[PDB]
């Protein structure tokens, strides 16, 4: 959130003339803020359209910033802790499964979608089931890759 402004000559305003000549529509691309319309926009001053000049080397270095350490994939999780997370998430899948079975069964012919959005079984048994299976798969299978690419190369 940034903007640039320059003043409109009061003499031009008193003359009723448009303060600038517009051969290009770029100035109107950004819809001004109703606050600015309250704060004197286009009566005392005007906005200036903003773009960003970006150098390619700056972009290479910027991309380098978010690059995780190439070793971070090597940092394997402790087997005991990983297994306990698996256990807990499996029990959570059990709880969500039973909740969801009730939710599918209790669902009547006139099932209110609005009421379901406001309040569903265990927040939403289906959504938590999906997220938990996704995270469990991801963690197990990344641990898989890690352990064994180590096996090969070490």
């Amino acid at each position: 959130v940034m903007d640039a402004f320059r003043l409109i000559n009061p003499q031009t305003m008193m003359l009723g003339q448009e303060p600038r000549q517009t051969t290009s529509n770029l100035g109107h691309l950004n819809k001004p803020s109703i606050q600015a319309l309250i704060h004197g926009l286009n009566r005392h001053y005007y906005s200036i359209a903003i773009n960003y000049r970006k150098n390619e080397l700056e972009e290479k270095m910027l991309l380098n910033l978010h690059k995780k350490k190439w070793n971070d994939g090597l940092t394997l999780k402790k087997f005991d802790v990983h297994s306990k997370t698996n256990e807990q998430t499996v029990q959570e899948m059990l709880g969500l499964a039973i909740k969801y079975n009730k939710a599918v069964q209790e669902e009547d012919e006139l099932t209110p979608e609005k009421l379901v959005i406001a309040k569903v079984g265990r927040q939403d048994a289906k959504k938590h089931l999906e997220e938990h299976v996704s995270n469990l798969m991801s963690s197990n299978i990344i641990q898989t890759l890690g352990t064994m690419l180590d096996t090969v190369i070490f």
């Binding site: 991801s138 299978i141 890759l145 096996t151 090969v152």
Partner: protein, 89 residues
């Protein structure tokens, strides 16, 4: 067919017994003379060692026993499974 049967019998004997007495080796392969069994062993199956009148079958390092294969290869088979699986995800 007799030659094939003798070869098959030799194959079974190699897996079955760690050692076999030469008399028994002749009896199972029905060789008429000692020199017959000796010649057969020398030509078809040189890996057999004859020690103190008993045929010593050089049993494989790890074969009959279960879970006696390579670790890295199995586990990297799990690599193939996992990586090919989720990359789709």
């Amino acid at each position: 067919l007799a030659k094939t049967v003798r070869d098959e019998i030799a194959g079974c004997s190699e897996k079955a017994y760690d050692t076999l007495s030469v008399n028994d080796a002749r009896q199972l392969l029905l060789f008429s003379s000692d020199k017959d069994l000796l010649e057969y062993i020398k030509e078809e199956h040189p890996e057999w060692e004859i020690k103190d009148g008993c045929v010593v079958f050089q049993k494989s390092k790890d074969s009959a026993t279960c879970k006696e294969i390579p670790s890295l290869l199995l586990i990297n088979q799990t690599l193939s499974y996992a990586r090919e699986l989720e990359r789709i995800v």
